[PDB]
Design an enzyme around this catalytic site. Structure first.
Site, PDB file in Angstrom:
ATOM      1  CG  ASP A 102     -52.518  55.740   1.147  1.00 17.39           C
ATOM      2  OD1 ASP A 102     -53.124  54.816   0.552  1.00 17.39           O
ATOM      3  OD2 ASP A 102     -53.057  56.804   1.541  1.00 17.39           O
ATOM      4  CG  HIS A 119     -57.478  53.745   8.699  1.00 17.14           C
ATOM      5  ND1 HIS A 119     -58.782  54.033   8.405  1.00 17.14           N
ATOM      6  CD2 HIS A 119     -56.862  53.629   7.506  1.00 17.14           C
ATOM      7  CE1 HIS A 119     -58.943  54.006   7.096  1.00 17.14           C
ATOM      8  NE2 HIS A 119     -57.793  53.751   6.528  1.00 17.14           N
TER       9      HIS A 119
HETATM   10  C1  HEM Z   1     -58.955  59.775   4.952  1.00 11.96           C
HETATM   11  C2  HEM Z   1     -57.776  59.467   4.466  1.00 11.96           C
HETATM   12  C3  HEM Z   1     -57.305  58.083   4.409  1.00 11.96           C
HETATM   13  C4  HEM Z   1     -55.996  57.835   4.593  1.00 11.96           C
HETATM   14  C5  HEM Z   1     -54.995  58.950   4.718  1.00 11.96           C
HETATM   15  C6  HEM Z   1     -55.810  56.403   4.627  1.00 11.96           C
HETATM   16  C7  HEM Z   1     -54.556  55.808   4.837  1.00 11.96           C
HETATM   17  C8  HEM Z   1     -54.309  54.457   4.997  1.00 11.96           C
HETATM   18  C9  HEM Z   1     -53.063  53.870   5.409  1.00 11.96           C
HETATM   19  C10 HEM Z   1     -51.818  54.677   5.731  1.00 11.96           C
HETATM   20  C11 HEM Z   1     -53.238  52.527   5.467  1.00 11.96           C
HETATM   21  C12 HEM Z   1     -52.216  51.521   5.893  1.00 11.96           C
HETATM   22  C13 HEM Z   1     -51.389  51.094   4.710  1.00 11.96           C
HETATM   23  C14 HEM Z   1     -52.191  50.345   3.697  1.00 11.96           C
HETATM   24  O1  HEM Z   1     -52.503  49.132   3.979  1.00 11.96           O
HETATM   25  O2  HEM Z   1     -52.470  51.016   2.633  1.00 11.96           O
HETATM   26  C15 HEM Z   1     -54.594  52.302   5.095  1.00 11.96           C
HETATM   27  C16 HEM Z   1     -55.164  51.076   5.033  1.00 11.96           C
HETATM   28  C17 HEM Z   1     -56.469  50.896   4.647  1.00 11.96           C
HETATM   29  N1  HEM Z   1     -57.404  51.842   4.432  1.00 11.96           N
HETATM   30 FE1  HEM Z   1     -57.188  53.751   4.535  1.00 11.96          FE
HETATM   31  N2  HEM Z   1     -56.981  55.809   4.500  1.00 11.96           N
HETATM   32  C18 HEM Z   1     -57.941  56.749   4.376  1.00 11.96           C
HETATM   33  C19 HEM Z   1     -59.279  56.541   4.199  1.00 11.96           C
HETATM   34  C20 HEM Z   1     -59.857  55.262   4.013  1.00 11.96           C
HETATM   35  C21 HEM Z   1     -61.262  55.011   3.814  1.00 11.96           C
HETATM   36  C22 HEM Z   1     -62.399  56.087   3.771  1.00 11.96           C
HETATM   37  C23 HEM Z   1     -61.312  53.615   3.696  1.00 11.96           C
HETATM   38  C24 HEM Z   1     -62.461  52.786   3.455  1.00 11.96           C
HETATM   39  C25 HEM Z   1     -63.607  53.331   3.209  1.00 11.96           C
HETATM   40  C26 HEM Z   1     -60.011  53.052   3.799  1.00 11.96           C
HETATM   41  C27 HEM Z   1     -59.734  51.721   3.770  1.00 11.96           C
HETATM   42  C28 HEM Z   1     -58.513  51.185   4.105  1.00 11.96           C
HETATM   43  C29 HEM Z   1     -58.306  49.741   4.099  1.00 11.96           C
HETATM   44  C30 HEM Z   1     -59.347  48.671   3.770  1.00 11.96           C
HETATM   45  C31 HEM Z   1     -56.997  49.525   4.495  1.00 11.96           C
HETATM   46  C32 HEM Z   1     -56.205  48.176   4.748  1.00 11.96           C
HETATM   47  C33 HEM Z   1     -56.858  46.968   5.561  1.00 11.96           C
HETATM   48  C34 HEM Z   1     -55.846  45.898   6.017  1.00 11.96           C
HETATM   49  O3  HEM Z   1     -54.739  46.285   6.448  1.00 11.96           O
HETATM   50  O4  HEM Z   1     -56.088  44.644   6.022  1.00 11.96           O
HETATM   51  N3  HEM Z   1     -59.150  54.086   4.020  1.00 11.96           N
HETATM   52  N4  HEM Z   1     -55.237  53.495   4.813  1.00 11.96           N
END
Ligand code: HEM
Ligand code: HEM
Ligand code: HEM
Ligand code: HEM
Lengths: 306, 305, 306, 306, 305, 306
Positions: F146, F219
């Site tokens: 993450d 996601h």
């Molecule tokens: C609910 C728990 C959440 C978890 C456990 C989570 C976890 C992750 C993980 C594992 C990734 C892929 C690795 C990374 O690129 O960091 C990711 C990417 C991302 N998350 Fe989340 N996330 C959560 C909630 C959110 C929310 C609410 C948003 C936006 C409002 C968000 C926005 C993003 C974005 C923008 C990316 C990367 C976009 C790209 O790869 O170009 N996340 N998140």
């Protein structure tokens, strides 16, 4: 009295394994080096303290022993016993001397290896040279955590060091090495669930699969032995990945210390030849042994006195 | 216009991977170049901030013409062979370079694995070298290696293409050479003599004063000044490697500059000599067994295909 | 065993050597401090653990011992013997107490030294205060790696701690100190090959010179002594450089612990007076001793309870 | 921007302050050293990367500037101005050259000091040499946290470096040094509450005392100065404890960089001479300045070209 | 014979204290967990070595012991003794199992606690869960250095581990826990000089107050006991702060290990009930006990069966 | 420039999230705190350098802004928008102030939180308090790495900081928080292959799934948006796990910073309401939002000046 070699080294992140044969007439040059090996460890290693953790363990093979010393032989010492299984073949390869060199940095290992082989050029012939490194979070090439169930502290002293049963050589140990080469293409074709079936533990969390569920041809199943004694039979392992991406070589260098090779050799039988309820260790369907040698690693004071 | 990680911090481990592109591999290669940036992060991110994983990708002259059409980097050409009176700098094949660096070997290896994984079938490996820091930044000859490299803004100005080839600004020109040393012979010298070969003190790494420093010392022949009187600098990150079994002891040379003219001048002086020097004495104990020149583009050039 | 003082310290990179004499009437203030010295070590050190590695070893001179305690004396305890050699003179300077304070940071040494000298204001007179620092690759002021052949583990216990041979004082040791100043200008006038001939090891790689090349007047030659058995007689050293650039002072502060001073004193005779084979230790042609004191460092129990 | 010396060093835990005067005729030898000083930093410091953080800042005094250089003078450069207050005296001591040497280990500092003074032996005369060490939680000799309110990053670049207001010497800075010796006996006679009143912050937690409880004769009160601008005037400090327990010397070595000495000099007036609401800084009731010099620390490019 | 649990852990900066009771019929699920607890410690901890320093010590209450095993009981094992003092009350609260989980990072504690409570879902009921953190210079919530006079090495072995006096259970120890909440407002009302009079050491330098000036109602005074033979009686503590800023809870979680509880209990009597010289420990005028439980932490071998 | 708050922090292992509302008549106590908050950061943090990496970011809600200041409002500042999806609901809970406190150790966070809530006793009411911890390989509560695709360096400056488009408040940023609870039981019921389909990356190696194979309801799919500009729209996240094993609570605390909330809000719409090709983000089938608040985190200069 007696001080053993640094068999029970802490966790180290680099290693060199050097296996060589003694040429004809080399025996004198080698005996000189064995008396000095301890002092070269210090020469190279002292300046890098205390981060260094540089340690060399020297081992001697069965035929080499008779060329070098007469007098007593350690009880368990013999050439590696080839295992010609139904499917999988544990081979036996030549090897008179082992240097198992470990530190927190590769350069220290290399420096010591340099000084050792410097004194020995002329007298020996290198059979195998491997530069090993830790992968991430104590993981091996197969992507599983590697070393978890090793014994520690008191239980290690008990499972590894020769004691009163061969009192002449107390402080020694028996090392078995084997170079394995993996078929990664095949392995990465599996689901993680299926990989865990091969190994017997969970990949990510490294928790043992329960009795309820763990296959009997899993690696962890076949390497768990209980004695007549009813107590577990343990060895100490320091498996090191190695490789080259260019020549598609991805490896695990296996080294196993035990107070008697009977233990190590039993685990091997079970892996290659099978039990009542298991054909062979599933791990071998992705791993090929290309070496195999056995050595005795005397107490440190034995080498000092030459 | 942001560049590749040519100015990396001090790292203790490296993999040098040099490959040629098989016929019909051009497509598989172009795909990989666009993704190479994102694999760096995948593998490297979870080991931060100890990790210091960086990959620099470079492209050879002949390979450039197979992969892209349009304008070429001004200075890009095959490595020039040097046929000196005594010493010969050879040219070996090399279409792609991956200069992979980190604080741990395994990070280098994991990235090398993922890259060669996407290219199995498209390429043929020519050279793979696993390098390590010896001790206190010493090289295989026992001297401290890196001391007079430029840093900060002076390095920016010495290594990165600017206005003089504006199409490719952010790029650099890397030259690689694998050298093997005859340690036998080298350890035959007194230390005072070895210092005369290199041009610095062994243990303290202080320059020899201009009144004692030979004109055939390595430091002498690799100090070049321009017409305008200012120093001409490159950035090096020499890495030792070897194998004690095969009595192979080496220094892998890599030199980045904003134009290869600079790197190439130093080489001419080393192999062919000056008025006052037949050749760099360091070559009497070092043999070049590779030689390749690459262009390392700005990072946006790779992202955008 | 009895618990001994921290004589077997790890490698630490900073030290304060404090040598004092006891004024008339100070006997009482000193006895109080010795009982509390153990607990000041912990006060100052505990909050920096485990990076800190703060240790203080307290030692007591011959004449001071008789002022402070009645009852038995340690068998080996006596004033340092002046050695009036043909060329070199090992001098004897006054010292009733020794505090050998070591840690990984200078400030910790200084905080404990402050607390100790604070409790002794009035009672003592400072004779010597040195602030020492290890060069970054365990080298000393001459440019050689310093400490390589020190014993470790069980061999060190055997070499430095009083045992059954004076059972009253088991856990104690005998410290000898000497402050040396070096003639660096002269030293840097030698080739490295020549410097190696003075010391008896290789400068850069720190490997012993082979028996057939090593001069009989080298430092390592004259300080290797063999006992009745023909087994080596060892001491534990923790030489520290010190100095001052402004007043061209470059020094090595010598401290050696042994289970009996006869050992340390033999090495000194060989160095200052010579053997049949050797006029004197060549290291003295570049090093002048300007202090010399001998102390007994009791078991820690002995301090706690009075 | 032109390249400045390493004024903005990170936190470093060791330092050597060396102050010298140029004997007559020495000016050629000194010009030589200034051109090479940059490259000696790297000779010594390169091999120790990245832990080393070795940095040397060279500064030149008013009188020495005129003896040494060609053309125009830095705008703010002058001899340190003695301050003859009703009670306290800020003295002015001789000093032509400053080497402010910093690193994470004392030995690196010492090595560089050695090499510098090596090139200068003959041509200069040492006035002052201090070996400084940080306490383990950024505390000074009075037991208070020291460094807290220094500026960082952009604000520091702006408050320390000469810019377009003296464009010949942009990248330089103005250092003021002063060695202070403390009266520990006196100071430790105060309640903590009272000590906090002297400094203007809490001892243990290092929080600023609230506006209506903080005395106007507190150190923090008198050294907070506002410009005509209405904005705060900032300097950059790297105060280092030093001392000797033997000679009851406990010290704080004050060094203060600013883009113009006007800023530093204002704080000093306020301290020694008083304000409307305050006789003098209470800290001086426990601290005696025994040196005082001012220097200009040129841009790095300036030194290279000699 | 016996390997003990990790009672002598190195200095660690994070902890989870987990106290549960066993539901009716849970006896079986619990026995299974105890046999495997050793191997969960390694699973979770091994891959974090050597930074991790993850350790779990498992302890069992008096009433729970009789539910789980038949055969001998540890000689000293009994329910925590309530102390109803003139002023202060040391309470006894329910608790069948203790997990004292320690590491350098909180997440490691949490991953092991997850795995443990995972295998016990259904069988137990949580009574107490505390997440502790040591302040950066080994200080506690009152601002004093906490741990200084703990025994080390061989003297700790002697003070904490059951030996020949109950050889059936050699390698075990007796843990006493108490959760304390502090009135910080009151505490920070004192001068430092006064606070030192409560504790018995100097705040900043952590030096003992001299025998003449140390109050007999100071904490260090009342917790120094000597035995009949005149040698000092020691325990091993690993007090950890915890709290919540939101709900103005600031706490010290007390845990003390000893080779018999008689020792720990004597210190408590002196603290709560007083001596001739002292009404009670002054530290209690700023600290309230809201838990109190006693456990036996067996040798590690005893669990493996 | 103006200096912004520490929004672009390095990698930190620990955090405290504090959300409060301002009681009647609290406005004055709060304004005092905001002016001093920068200097409490330094008080607490300076003595723990350089390991500490303590940083506090303070943010202010829409309704609170109007109580505290008059004059201009930040362009994008408004109450969190509830999103009532077909299936999943992104809720709005109250919050006037946010303290986003980060360091390498939890205790440092706690000490700063203590000092802050100390100055606000009486004036506020806590709405949420969370103690967060990174798992040792930058993983979150679901077992995935993450933070990987967060922008760094200059691209982060460009994505997070208010610039010329609202020049009054340049250096500020817009933080959105949401506390999520996971149904871990359900999550661990999936194969890893399935979990990777939910997230859009490989669990073990953290490599993006290829565009051909990555589901449109993953996601990573739904949170990659492209602008009018054709270039990707980025935010900066610092998700932190938290929980309690006693109350079977396993959570991820979400915080996302952007130069305008339209960006953050778009990603949320896509998650909760769906696209043409996706009903909703699959991650929500295992994660429930139980808070939701939006804050403006001003430039640091804006706070200093009250
Ligand atoms: C609910 C728990 C959440 C978890 C456990 C989570 C976890 C992750 C993980 C594992 C990734 C892929 C690795 C990374 O690129 O960091 C990711 C990417 C991302 N998350 Fe989340 N996330 C959560 C909630 C959110 C929310 C609410 C948003 C936006 C409002 C968000 C926005 C993003 C974005 C923008 C990316 C990367 C976009 C790209 O790869 O170009 N996340 N998140
Ligand atoms: C390709 C070779 C090998 C690989 C990659 C390998 C890898 C592993 C892995 C992943 C584990 C599980 C983690 C652990 O408990 O350390 C393990 C366990 C073990 N391995 Fe191996 N292994 C290899 C060869 C061997 C060989 C040749 C032997 C014995 C001769 C051996 C003996 C053991 C034992 C005894 C265990 C632990 C049993 C217990 O759970 O109580 N391994 N190995
Ligand atoms: C053959 C193995 C090589 C070794 C072992 C080696 C080693 C060294 C060493 C020890 C130094 C002095 C310390 C330092 O300044 O880095 C140095 C300096 C240098 N080397 Fe090399 N080098 C090698 C090949 C080359 C090649 C092929 C080039 C250029 C084409 C080169 C360019 C330089 C430069 C430019 C300097 C610094 C000049 C200055 O002091 O102002 N080296 N090298
Ligand atoms: C014996 C000499 C000195 C000692 C022991 C000392 C100690 C301290 C201490 C404890 C602080 C508070 C923590 C901090 O902000 O660093 C401080 C602040 C300060 N000192 Fe000193 N100091 C000394 C001399 C000086 C001198 C000579 C100057 C200037 C000419 C100076 C200028 C300052 C300034 C500007 C501040 C901070 C202003 C602010 O809080 O906004 N100090 N000093």
């Amino acid at each position: 009295e007696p001080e053993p070699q640094m068999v029970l080294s802490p966790l180290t992140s680099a290693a060199i394994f050097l296996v060589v044969t003694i040429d004809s007439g080399g025996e004198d040059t080698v005996r000189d080096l064995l008396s000095d090996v301890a002092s070269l460890e210090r020469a190279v290693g002292f300046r890098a303290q205390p981060d260094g953790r540089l340690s060399c363990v020297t081992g001697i093979g069965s035929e080499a022993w008779d060329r070098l010393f007469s007098g007593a032989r350690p009880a368990g010492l013999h050439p590696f016993r080839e295992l010609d299984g139904p499917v999988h073949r544990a081979v036996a390869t030549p090897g008179d001397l082992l240097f198992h060199i470990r530190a927190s940095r590769l350069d220290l290992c290399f420096a010591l290896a340099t000084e050792i082989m410097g004194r020995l050029r002329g007298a020996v012939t290198p059979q195998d040279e491997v530069h090993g490194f830790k992968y991430f979070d104590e993981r091996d090439m197969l992507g599983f955590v590697d070393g978890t169930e090793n014994p520690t502290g008191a239980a290690a002293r008990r499972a590894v060091l020769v004691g009163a049963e061969d009192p002449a050589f107390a402080g020694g140990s028996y090392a078995v090495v084997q170079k394995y080469l993996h078929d990664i293409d095949a392995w990465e074709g599996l689901s993680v669930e299926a990989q865990e079936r091969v190994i017997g533990r969970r990949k990510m969390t490294d928790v043992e699969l329960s009795d309820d569920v763990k296959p009997a041809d899993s690696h962890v199943a076949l390497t768990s032995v209980t004695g007549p004694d009813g107590s577990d039979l343990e060895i100490l392992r320091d498996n090191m990945p190695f490789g080259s991406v260019g020549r598609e070589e991805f490896g695990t260098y296996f080294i196993g210390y035990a107070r008697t090779p009977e233990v190590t050799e039993t685990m091997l039988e079970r892996m290659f030849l099978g039990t009542a309820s298991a054909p062979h260790d599933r791990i071998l369907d992705f791993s090929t042994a290309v070496t195999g040698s056995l050595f005795f690693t005397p107490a440190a004071d034995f080498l000092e006195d030459l």
